[PDB]
Amino acid sequence: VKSIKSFIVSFSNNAPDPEKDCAMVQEFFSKMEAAFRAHPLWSGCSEEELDSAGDGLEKYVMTKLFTRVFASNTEEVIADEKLFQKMSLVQQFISPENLDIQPTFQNESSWLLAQKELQKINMYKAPRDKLVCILNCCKVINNLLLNASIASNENAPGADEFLPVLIYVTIKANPPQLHSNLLYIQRYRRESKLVGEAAYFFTNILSAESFISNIDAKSISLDEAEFEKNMESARAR
């Protein structure tokens, strides 16, 4: 416990730099995972019980460090604003058909729930809690596609459906500070946990940010003149 508070105080005495900060934080978490493993208190117990301790430590550490490391330079804030501005125009006119997804009552009610789960990301400081919002949103989408596969006679689209639904959900959610939220998770979620399904879900939203940020007429199946008209309509609010 002593390690942690004196880690945090003297950590916060280093001059802030996102790369050194996250390098130092990830090494600290990684050393602590090794120590939990070796501590009389965690003998014989499962990886669930060990990850649980790791997660407690992450949240404790990251709650103190949050204001120092989250959205704390101009480059990050400028990209946050730029991405928000863009989604706030595009969400006014993008349709499901633009991304080849079917707006049935069933689909829509899940998309709306996925959107609501994603919108909670700004209620939390901890990388894990922020991430869970993304995983919960992706799980809702995952389960929609799973049930569609039992209910139907054509072969499941897989990622061909999964990604555009996520792109649509993210555009509709337009969570404030998405760019900085994603970088923060990438930097500060302990590396040993950003693997497997969680990494597949997380990379998917990362790739959605990239697509959304790069949206033009062609990428959303619109011709130039219509897209310009829509963006113009959106700009007038």
Partner: protein, 165 residues
């Protein structure tokens, strides 16, 4: 012990989603650790003999998502580039995925070329030898697969596991 990120790449209709479905469905009988999702699966395969846990990433094949691919194959232990043997253009698209991965993927990535829908005998347009020659020249291996009949499906994943470091 051994976790291995494997990315599925190939154009629309080649068989990405079908291939991994066939793989995981047939492996059910082995009663190993597994995760079934719509676009991600994990599957532990006994290959003689240690644990390989495949973390299998399905990708959206539409050409508008192409520029996102690097985000997926980042850190990948392995890639299967799928094409439809009955479609010349799909094979051409597969060649570009290979070139791209050679240029931008981890040096250690194990690459496999899957000539899928090998079961469509009358319709085949790409030959084994033209696909095998291409595999030889670019340091990967080629295997004809059929998600439909299961032909070589287990065998492609097994063969990659054997080539892992």
């Amino acid at each position: 012990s051994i976790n291995a990120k494997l990315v599925l790449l190939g154009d629309v209709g080649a068989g990405k989603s079908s291939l991994v479905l066939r793989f995981v469905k047939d492996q059910f009988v082995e009663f190993q650790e597994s995760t079934i999702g719509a676009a991600f699966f994990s599957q532990t395969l006994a290959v003689n003999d240690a644990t390989v846990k495949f973390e299998i990433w399905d990708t959206a094949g539409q050409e508008r998502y192409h520029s996102l691919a690097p985000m997926y194959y980042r850190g990948a232990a392995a890639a299967i580039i799928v094409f439809d043997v009955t479609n010349q253009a799909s094979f051409e698209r597969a060649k570009k995925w290979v070139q791209e991965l050679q240029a931008q993927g981890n040096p250690n990535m194990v690459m496999a070329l899957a000539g899928n829908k090998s079961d469509l005998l009358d319709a085949r347009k790409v030959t084994a030898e033209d696909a095998q020659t291409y595999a030889q020249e670019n340091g990967l291996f080629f295997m004809e697969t059929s998600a439909k009949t299961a032909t070589n499906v287990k065998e492609i994943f097994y063969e990659i596991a054997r080539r892992l470091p």
